C-alpha cells in the first residue's frame, strides 16, 4: 500500500499537469487565433512589454550563429539610442537565450532529416492583402509558446504535490487542484499574456516551495537537498527580477518557523546554504548586477544565517516570548542595517520604485512616475469583484476554516510560554505555508497582479481540510460532500472561461507599420508612447529611444522628456528636447490627448509637477487641431507627416 500510493500520486500529478497544459493552450488559441494569423500579425498580437521580450528571441534566431546573436543582445545599441546597454541582465532575457539556443539546432537538423515539422498554406483576408499563416512546432512563434506552456503546465502538478504534502492524503491534493481549476481565472493569465516574465518564473518558484515543504516535513539534509533547492532557485532568479522579493517573503516565513523550534538545526543549515549558493550563482550569471545587492534578499540571507548559527548559544533560554522577541529584533535590525548600509552607504542607490508606489497609496506622494503606475489598474488595490468571485467558489471560506482549525490545534498542542531547545514541535511545513499565505495575501491586497501568489496558496491552505491528524466512514463521506459542492459552483467558471473569444484585430497599426516600412530609412530613430515603441521595434526593426520596461535607471528620465509633448511646454522647448535626444519621428494617438477622473490623463499629470506652466495652451490642444485643420501652420517646426482616420499621428522632427 506504500508503493501503490506513491506511484498513483506521481501519475495523477503528471496527468493534472498535462490537463492544465492543454487547457491553457486552448484558451490561448481561443484568445489570439494564431492559427489563421500571419507571422507579422502574430507579432502585433504581443502588446506592450511582450513585443520587447519576443524581439530579442527573434534577433538571436536570425543571427548567423548563436554566439553572434548573444553578442548582439549583450552590446545592444538600438533599444535605447544614445548609449550601449546589456539587455541580457537588464530585462532578464535568459528564457529567450535558452529557447533560441534550443531552436536553432532543432530547425538545422530538421532540414537534414527532411521532416516537414512546419505546415502552412495561403490565407486570404479580403479587403487587405493576402498573407501566410504558418503552423507546426517548426514555426518560431509556436516553439516559443510551446516552451512557455510546457513550463506553465507544471504549476498544477506542483499544487497537487503541495496539497498531498500538507495534508498527507490524496483527498487534500484533489481539493487543491480542484480549487485551482475552478479559480483558474484569478490564479494565472499565462493564456492572455504568454511572453511575460512571471509566466517563465512562477512555476519554478512554486516548485521551490514544494521542495522546501518536502525538506521541512521529513527533516532532510545533505548535499542532495542543496542541489535540488538550487536547481529550482537559480532559474527563478535568472528570470523575473521580482523573484528576489518572493524569496524574501519565504525567508521571513522560515525564520518564524525556526523561532518556534519547528525546524531542526541541520535542516535549516541546509536551507540557508542552498540560498547562499543560489544567490551567488544568480549574481554571477547576471554579470554582477548591482541591483541584486541592496535588495532585501541578500541581507535577509545573511541575517537568517547569523540567527541560525548563533542559535545553539541560546539553548538554555526557557521563556519563549523573550527568545522570539530577541531573534526578531536581531533579524529585523541586521537586515535593515545591511540594506541601508549599502544603499545610503557605499552609494549603490538601487531602484526604489516598489517603495514609491506604496508611499503614494497611504501618503500624498504624487510623483508623475508613480502616477504612470497607480492609474494603470494593475498596480491598484484589489477589487471587490475579485473577492466576491473567490468567495463564489467557496475558496475563501474553505481556506479560512482550515486556517482557524490549524490555529486551534497549534495553540492547544504546544507550551506557549516555555520552550525546550531539545524537542522539535512537529508540523513545521504547515506553519511555513500558512505564514507564506499571510505574506502573499498582504502583497495581493496591496498591488493586484500579486494575486498570482495569493490564489494558489489559498488552494494549498484549503487542502488542509483532509488532514487526518487534525471515523473513516464519516471522514470519507463528508470529504466527497465537499468535493461535490465544489463541483457545483466551479463548473460554471470553467465553462464561462472556455466560452470567451477575443476581438478581431484592427487594421490601423498594420497600415502605420507599412508606412514606416516604406517611407522611412532603416536607421531612423523613433520616439513615442511606450506601448507603441515596443511594436515599432519588434517589427520594422527601427532604433527607438524609449521602451515600456521602464523600471530601471537610465530610461526613467527619458520617458519624462518624451511625454513632455503632452505637457504645456512651448513648441521650441519640446522641439529642442527632441533634437537633443536625436529622434526623427514621434508616434502617438489622439486618444492620448483627451480631456471626469483627472490625474490619469497627461493633461492633468503635467500640472502636479509643472505648476509654473499651467494656464498656457496645452500641446495636445495644438496637435488635435493641427491634425484636424490638415495644415501644420501653428506648429512651425513640427510637421504632421502621417495622419490617417485620425487615430495614429506621426510627427517628423525638423
Amino acid at each position, epitope marked *: 500500500y506504500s508503493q501503490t500510493w506513491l506511484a498513483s500520486v506521481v501519475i495523477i500529478g503528471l496527468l493534472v499537469g498535462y490537463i492544465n497544459y492543454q487547457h491553457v493552450y486552448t484558451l490561448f488559441e481561443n484568445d489570439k487565433h494564431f492559427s489563421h494569423l500571419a507571422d507579422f500579425e502574430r507579432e502585433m498580437a504581443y502588446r506592450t512589454e511582450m513585443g520587447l521580450y519576443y524581439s530579442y528571441y527573434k534577433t538571436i534566431i536570425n543571427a548567423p550563429s548563436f554566439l553572434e546573436g548573444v553578442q548582439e543582445i549583450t552590446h545592444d545599441t538600438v533599444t535605447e539610442h544614445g548609449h550601449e546597454i546589456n539587455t541580457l541582465n537588464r530585462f532578464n532575457l535568459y528564457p529567450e537565450v535558452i529557447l533560441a539556443f534550443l531552436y536553432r539546432p532543432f530547425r538545422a537538423f530538421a532540414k537534414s532529416a527532411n521532416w516537414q515539422i512546419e505546415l502552412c498554406w495561403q490565407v486570404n483576408r479580403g479587403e487587405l492583402r493576402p498573407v501566410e499563416s504558418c503552423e507546426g512546432i517548426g514555426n518560431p512563434h509556436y516553439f516559443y509558446i510551446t516552451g512557455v506552456f510546457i513550463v506553465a503546465g507544471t504549476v498544477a502538478s506542483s499544487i497537487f504535490y503541495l496539497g498531498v504534502l500538507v495534508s498527507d492524503s490524496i483527498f487534500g491534493g484533489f481539493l487543491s487542484v480542484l480549487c485551482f481549476a475552478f479559480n483558474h481565472g484569478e490564479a494565472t493569465r499565462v493564456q492572455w499574456t504568454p511572453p511575460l516574465r512571471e509566466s517563465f518564473a512562477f512555476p519554478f518558484i512554486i516548485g521551490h516551495i514544494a521542495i522546501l515543504t518536502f525538506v521541512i516535513k521529513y527533516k532532510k539534509s545533505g548535499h542532495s537537498m542543496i542541489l535540488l533547492l538550487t536547481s529550482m532557485a537559480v532559474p527563478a532568479l535568472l528570470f523575473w527580477q521580482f523573484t528576489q522579493f518572493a524569496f524574501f517573503t519565504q525567508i521571513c516565513s522560515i525564520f518564524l518557523a525556526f523561532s518556534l523550534d519547528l525546524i531542526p538545526f541541520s535542516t535549516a543549515k541546509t536551507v540557508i546554504h542552498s540560498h547562499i549558493i543560489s544567490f551567488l550563482i544568480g549574481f554571477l550569471l547576471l554579470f554582477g548586477n548591482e541591483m541584486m545587492i541592496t535588495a532585501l534578499y541578500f541581507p535577509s540571507i545573511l541575517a537568517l544565517g547569523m540567527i541560525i548559527y548563533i542559535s545553539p548559544l541560546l*539553548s*538554555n*533560554l*526557557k*521563556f519563549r516570548p*523573550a527568545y522570539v522577541l530577541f531573534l526578531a529584533i536581531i533579524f529585523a535590525s541586521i537586515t535593515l542595517g545591511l540594506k541601508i548600509g549599502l544603499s545610503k552607504g557605499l552609494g549603490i542607490e538601487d531602484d526604489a520604485h516598489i517603495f514609491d508606489i506604496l508611499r503614494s497609496k497611504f501618503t500624498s506622494f504624487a510623483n508623475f512616475h508613480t502616477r504612470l503606475y497607480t492609474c494603470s489598474a494593475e498596480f491598484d488595490f484589489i477589487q471587490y469583484s475579485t473577492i466576491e468571485k473567490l468567495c463564489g467558489t467557496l475558496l475563501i471560506p474553505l481556506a479560512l476554516i482550515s486556517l482557524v482549525t490549524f490555529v486551534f490545534n497549534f495553540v492547544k498542542n504546544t*507550551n506557549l*510560554l*516555555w520552550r*525546550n*531547545s*531539545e*524537542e522539535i514541535g512537529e508540523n513545521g511545513e504547515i506553519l511555513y505555508n500558512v505564514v507564506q499565505l499571510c505574506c502573499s495575501t498582504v502583497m495581493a491586497f496591496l498591488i493586484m497582479r500579486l494575486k498570482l501568489f495569493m490564489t494558489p496558496h489559498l488552494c494549498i491552505v484549503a487542502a488542509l481540510f483532509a488532514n487526518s491528524k487534525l471515523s473513516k466512514t464519516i471522514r470519507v463521506s463528508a470529504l466527497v460532500g465537499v468535493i461535490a459542492i465544489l463541483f457545483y459552483r466551479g463548473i460554471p467558471n470553467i465553462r464561462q472561461q472556455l466560452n470567451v473569444k477575443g476581438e478581431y484585430s484592427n487594421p490601423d497599426q498594420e497600415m502605420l507599420f507599412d508606412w514606416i516600412q516604406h517611407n522611412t530609412k532603416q536607421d531612423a530613430v523613433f520616439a513615442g508612447t511606450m506601448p507603441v515603441m515596443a511594436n515599432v521595434k519588434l517589427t520594422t526593426l527601427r532604433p527607438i529611444v524609449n521602451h515600456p520596461h521602464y523600471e530601471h535607471v537610465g530610461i526613467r528620465e527619458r520617458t519624462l522628456k518624451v511625454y513632455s509633448m503632452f505637457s504645456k511646454k512651448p513648441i521650441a522647448e519640446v522641439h529642442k528636447i527632441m533634437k537633443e535626444m536625436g529622434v526623427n519621428y514621434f508616434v502617438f494617438q489622439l486618444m492620448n490627448c483627451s480631456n471626469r477622473r483627472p490625474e490619469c490623463v497627461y493633461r492633468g499629470m503635467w500640472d502636479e509637477e509643472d505648476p509654473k506652466n499651467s494656464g498656457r495652451t496645452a500641446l495636445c490642444d495644438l496637435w488635435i487641431l493641427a491634425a484636424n485643420s490638415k495644415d501644420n501652420s501653428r506648429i512651425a517646426p513640427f510637421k504632421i507627416v502621417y495622419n490617417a482616420n485620425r487615430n495614429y499621428i506621426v510627427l517628423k522632427i525638423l
Partner: antibody
Amino acid sequence: EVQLVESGGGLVQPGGSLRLSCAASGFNISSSSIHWVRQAPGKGLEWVASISSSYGYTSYADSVKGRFTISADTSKNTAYLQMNSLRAEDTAVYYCARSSSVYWSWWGYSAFDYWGQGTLVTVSS
Amino acid sequence: DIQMTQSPSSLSASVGDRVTITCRASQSVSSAVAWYQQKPGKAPKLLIYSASSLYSGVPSRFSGSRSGTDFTLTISSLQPEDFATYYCQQGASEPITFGQGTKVEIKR
C-alpha cells in the same frame, strides 16, 4: 530585613471558601513573583499557583485550575489567595514562597529563597 | 507535564558517612533545578540553586553536581544537625514540580 508572613488559615467546612494573605517586609512587591506551595501530612511539596505583579500574570496548576484565584496588589506589598469549593484533599499547610518575576525569568524561575512559614487549613464535614 | 523520579526514597547512614542523593527529570531541563531541606514542623530553606551554586549561609558541606538530566546532592561529612528531608525541584516550566522527598536517618 526582607521577610514573609502569612495569615488566613484555620478550620472550615467542605464546599466553602476562604481567603488568605501573604505580606512581605523590606523589598517592595511587583519586583518579583510569589508562589503558593502545599504540604500535606506524610506527602511531598506541590506548587499551586504563581503571580507576577509587575503587569499581572497569574498561573495555576491544573489540579486546582479554575477554582483558586491569585490577586497581588503592590501598595500594601501583600498578595491574596482565595479558594472556593473546597475539596476533601485541600487540608494541608500552605507556604508563600518568592521567586523571580516571570517577565525576567529568562532561563527559568529563580529558586524559592525566602520561604514563608505557612498556615494550616483544614476541611471537615 | 514535567516530573522528577527519585530512587533513594529513604537513605540511612551514620554521622560522618558520605551520602549522595540523585534526581532525574523526564524532560531535559538544562540547569534550572534546585535542592531544598525541610525539618519536621518547619518551613523549607534553600540550599543549592542552578544545580551547582551553593547558597549563602548554608554550610559548605553540601555539594551539587549535574550531568545532563541527572543531578546529585552530596554530603561528605554527615552531621547530627543535617537530619531532615530533602527535595529536588525544577523551574524551567510553568507547572513547577518538586521531587518525592528523600529522608536521611541515623545508623544504629
